Assembly symmetry: D2
Homo-oligomer: 62 residues x 4
Amino acid sequence: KEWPLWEVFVRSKQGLEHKHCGSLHATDAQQALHMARDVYTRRQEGVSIWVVPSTAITASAP
Amino acid sequence: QKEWPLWEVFVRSKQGLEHKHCGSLHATDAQQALHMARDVYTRRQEGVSIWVVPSTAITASAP
Amino acid sequence: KEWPLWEVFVRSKQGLEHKHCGSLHATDAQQALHMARDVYTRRQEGVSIWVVPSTAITASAP
Amino acid sequence: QKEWPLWEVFVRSKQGLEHKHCGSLHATDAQQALHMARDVYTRRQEGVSIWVVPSTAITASAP
């Protein structure tokens, strides 16, 4: 059973845009969401979480 | 005639700590999306990190 | 509302591996699956369909 | 220590009409996956097209 890396972006109730706040391994997108919520929020009303597999991101070169 | 899918753009500024979502754009591939984001959103500032992600790769939490 | 391209692979009941059999536009992975099933199969018992966004595929250079 | 996610590999042979799934492998990125697939699955045959896809990008129909 595979556990790929996911990058996690959160936009708080107060906030206006999704901020990257870390990465975690999970078997799928839904598991990644339930972890992200547990681990990076405090069970708060109104927080939007995005998950993305790391393989999906392309970064600018240094 | 090529496909121009939607990409989400995240930027971390020079003195910035994390990547923040700053908008979307349509581009034929990841490298064109980077190039476009560099111009449209960072204005070629030194020291800025850009991440592009095809929209289809993002799973959002349910309202 | 966006309609990205998806690549579709099908493994028939009889078959041993998923074969690419085309591409279609859909709003999400689930819509892509219901189209693929309608359009590339004949509502048949035992067919496995995979959908992948085109942006996800990396190809070897000519 | 790098991540080595799972990739699905599809190949279309020289005289072949479509890409067929031929297996999986773990690799640090798409270019390393291509290189590995080229060796592991095609043995560097001329005229063969290889597609690699991270596993997370595939949605399967439900049994």
